Each structure stands twice: as structure tokens, then as C-alpha cells.
Structure 1
Amino acid sequence: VEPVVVIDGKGHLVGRLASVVAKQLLNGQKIVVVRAEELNISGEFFRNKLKYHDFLRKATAFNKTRGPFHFRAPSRIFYKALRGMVSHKTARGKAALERLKVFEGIPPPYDKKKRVVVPQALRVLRLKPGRKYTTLGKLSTSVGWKYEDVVAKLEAKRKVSSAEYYAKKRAFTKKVASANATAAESDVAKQLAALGY
């Protein structure tokens, strides 16, 4: 339905979002995921830190350089979870994976575009209230990501600029709604209301 779909990754569950997105890429939809530092994983922070340490133990014994690579950024953690669900070793899998780019924060190509959510992977809609969850940015900076604060500063600046945008947009839409209400109850308005618009 869309050329590119921009997904705001905030408040989403990692596995459910990855299983949605992998099927979208295999069907041929182009997906870009922004704000990867705000993904959520169900479970305690200590459980997921222990899980990452169990993953971090695994390496090739005779040469660590050819072993499993333990990527530390939240976007690369999401990429790992998604590459697990795409059959990446085939040409179809590579062609699917080249339709995806995942980012921490919202870069300047996508800060002026529209962000969507996936309601079947949202934490507030999936988890029972009371279950504990993690933040992927906190887990990733606990296991070695170096750029948690610069992303926070850039996101603060971007949010200031976006609020400055939204004030003007709200004023303009209030003018347009006022003019539409005053130009209603004419004959064309009543004919459109009879016809359903």
C-alpha cells in the first residue's frame, strides 16, 4: 500500500515486531525502523542481561575473530532478531534484507516523514499490566553501547523542532476547521451530508 513504511520502534516488543517486519520484507514491503533504542523486551532487566551474557560467552575457540559476532547497538540487536527469522543465507533472503534499514533515533531523511505503529506488537496492548519489561537502550548500554547520551541529546533537539512544527500545524488546522464549519450548512453541504460526506 505504501512505498516505504516508517515504523516508530518506541514501546514495541522485539520478537513480535521482528516477526511482523520479516514477513513484510519477504512479501516485498520496504520498511525503515526508527528509534530502535526504545524497544521493549518482556522480562526483568537482570534476566535479559543474563541472556545477553550467555550469548556473549559463545565464540569460536581456535579463533575468536570468525566466531558469532555480538553486536552491541540496539538496532543491530533488532537486526539479529530479524535475521533469525529471515532465511538470510539465500538470494531471496539477501534481497529481503536489503529492503530494511534500522536506526537509533530518527535521522534527517525520516524526521519529516510519518511514523506508524504495529498494534499487535505494542507493549501496552500485549503485556498484562504488572509484568516487568526492559528498555533496549538501557540493556545495550549496559552491555557495551557507547552512544546512549548523544542519541538522547539529538532526540531532545529533534523533539524541540518537532514541537515548533506542530504548533504551526495545529494553528493552521484550527483555521481550516473554523472555515469548514462556517462554510457548512449551505446547500452543497446539505447535499454532501445527504450523500454521506
Structure 2
Amino acid sequence: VEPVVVIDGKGHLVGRLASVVAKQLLNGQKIVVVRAEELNISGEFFRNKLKYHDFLRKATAFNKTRGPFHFRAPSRIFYKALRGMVSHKTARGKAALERLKVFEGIPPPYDKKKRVVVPQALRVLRLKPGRKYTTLGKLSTSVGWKYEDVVAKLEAKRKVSSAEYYAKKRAFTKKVASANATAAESDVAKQLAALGY
């Protein structure tokens, strides 16, 4: 519906979120993913770390600069899983990937926008209670990501600014709701109540 959909990556499963996003891109929808360092993967930390080390040892024998590239950033990790679900070698596939943006945290162009969630890919709604899961931000640092502290420092600053905005908005909503309740019990309100509004 919206021209651009902004998805908050916190508390999502990497595989199920990527499948949802990949289908949206091929249908002409634009998707923006924020806070990629808060993504979740089912399974304990040691299992996913061992799998990544297996991926690390796959490279071209005669020249390491031609083989697979092992990106470490959480945004790039999600991009790799998403690119595997899209036929990126075709002109149609390249067009779909041009509609995708992945970020760590919430950069200033999208901090004052509305973020949505995908109930299909939510970890809390999918994994059975008591199961193990891995946070993508912690895993990336273990394999060579070097910007976990700066993201945390800037993200803490963003929450302070956003909390102040919410306090002002909450007060304004309280004032409007009080006026709306006062305006009730009138003839216009009764007529609207008869028609469901």
C-alpha cells in the first residue's frame, strides 16, 4: 500500500524475513530494513558460528580475490541470504535488488518514519518457548565486524530523542481525546453512532 515499507529487523528470523522480502521485491514493492544487528537465527550461538567458519574456508584455490566474498556486517549477512532467494543474474533480478535497502540501526533518513513488523517471521510467534536462538549482532562481531560499539552508542542517542518526541505526542493525544469525549453526547455524535461511526 505504502510507496516505501520500512521493516524493523529486531526480533525477526533471518530466513523467514528474507523470503517475505524477496517476494515483495519481485512484485514491485520497495522495502527498507533497519536495525539489522537485532535479527535472530534459530539455534545456539556455537552452532551458527561453526556454520559460518565452514563458509569462511570456501574460497578459490589459485586466487583468493576471485572466490566467494565473506561479508561480516549484519546488514550484509542478511543481504546474502536474501540474494540467494532471487535470480540476481537476470535483468529482472537486478531490478528487484535495486529496490532493497539494509541498514544497521536506524539512520537519520528513516528515524522519523513508521516501522512495520512481519508476524510470519517474528521469532516470538514462531520458535517454541525454551528453544535457543542467536542474535545477528553478536555473531557478526565474532567473525570480524568492527562497528558494534558505534552502532550501540548512536542507537542509544536515538532512543533518547525519540522518547522525548513520544512524551510530547502522548500529551497531545491526551488533550485531543479529552476534547473528543467532551464533544460526545450531542446530536451529531448520536447520529454517527447510529451508522457505526
Normalised to the residue count of structure 2, the TM-score between the two structures is: 1.00
Q: Distance in 2 between matches of 1:51 and 1:185?
A: 65
Offset of 1:149 from its aligned partner?
A: 0.6
Offset of 1:53 from its aligned partner?
A: 0.2
Offset of 1:170 from its aligned partner?
A: 0.2
Unaligned segments of structure 2, at least 5 residues: none
Offset of 1:151 from its aligned partner?
A: 0.1
Offset of 1:2 from its aligned partner?
A: 1.0
The structure 1 segments of at least 4 consecutive aligned residues displaced by more than 2 Å after TM superposition are none
Offset of 1:196 from its aligned partner?
A: 0.4
- Can you list the C-alpha shifts for 1:153-187, whole angstroms capped at 9, x where unaligned? 00000000000000000000000000000001110
Unaligned segments of structure 1, at least 5 residues: none
Offset of 1:51 from its aligned partner?
A: 0.5
Offset of 1:32 from its aligned partner?
A: 0.3
2:129 match: 129
SS at match of 1:192: helix
- Can you list the C-alpha shifts for 1:65-113, whole angstroms capped at 9, x where unaligned? 0000000000000000000001000000000000001000000000000
Offset of 1:142 from its aligned partner?
A: 0.6
Offset of 1:54 from its aligned partner?
A: 0.4
Normalised to the residue count of structure 1, the TM-score between the two structures is: 1.00
- 1:1-197 aligned within 5 A: 1-197=1-197
Q: Distance in 2 between matches of 1:185 and 1:16?
A: 49
RMSD: 0.3
